[PDB]
Amino acid sequence: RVTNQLQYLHKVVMKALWKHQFAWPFRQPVDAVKLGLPDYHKIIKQPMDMGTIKRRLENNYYWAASECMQDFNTMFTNCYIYNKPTDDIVLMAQTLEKIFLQKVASMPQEEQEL
Numbered sequence: 001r002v003t004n005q006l007q008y009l010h011k012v013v014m015k016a017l018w019k020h021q022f023a024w025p026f027r028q029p030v031d032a033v034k035l036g037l038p039d040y041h042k043i044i045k046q047p048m049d050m051g052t053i054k055r056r057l058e059n060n061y062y063w064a065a066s067e068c069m070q071d072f073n074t075m076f077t078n079c080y081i082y083n084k085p086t087d088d089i090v091l092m093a094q095t096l097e098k099i100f101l102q103k104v105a106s107m108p109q110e111e112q113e114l
């Protein structure tokens with residue numbers, strides 16, 4: 001579906017996050033071979049990244065905004081679960097997610113199809 005809320009997530013939320021200076025590690029799926037993490041996919045069962053979310057927005061994959069919000073959430077949660085507490089990537093994820101939440105607080109409240 002195209003909905004008012006999904007449009008907002010695309011044009012306001014994703015727009016802001018995608019261009020952020022800390023976004024780069026999250027713009028494509030985690031490549032476990034490249035990063036040297038043979039257990040990544042053993043620990044993280046549902047990988048997610050902003051490249052995938054952007055494409056889903058662009059291709060009208062989502063039926064409701066809440067679905068897209070859960071993908072954003074999964075991407076951040078994966079990061080917090082996998083990485084060590086002191087890893088810089090955790091700080092970068094937190095920074096992005098703060099913007100995610102700030103923007104989500106201003107999303108249109110009633111979802112309507114277009």
Ligand SMILES: Cc1noc(C)c1-c1cc(S(=O)(=O)NC2CCCC2)c2cccnc2c1
Pocket residue numbers: 004007011108114
């Ligand atoms: C401005 C304007 N003047 O005439 C038209 C037509 C627009 C308009 C309408 C929509 S929408 O109807 O698809 N979604 C609405 C629902 C919530 C707010 C946007 C946009 C959608 C995306 C970008 N520009 C949009 C601009």
Ligand SMILES: Cc1noc(C)c1-c1cc(S(=O)(=O)NC2CCCC2)c2cccnc2c1
Pocket residue numbers: 024025026030035037078079082083088089092
């Ligand atoms: C693991 C992992 N789990 O979620 C994400 C996201 C990652 C992650 C981690 C690294 S890194 O640890 O090599 N560099 C850190 C240093 C500070 C920036 C990230 C990447 C390195 C390159 C590309 N993607 C990366 C993605």
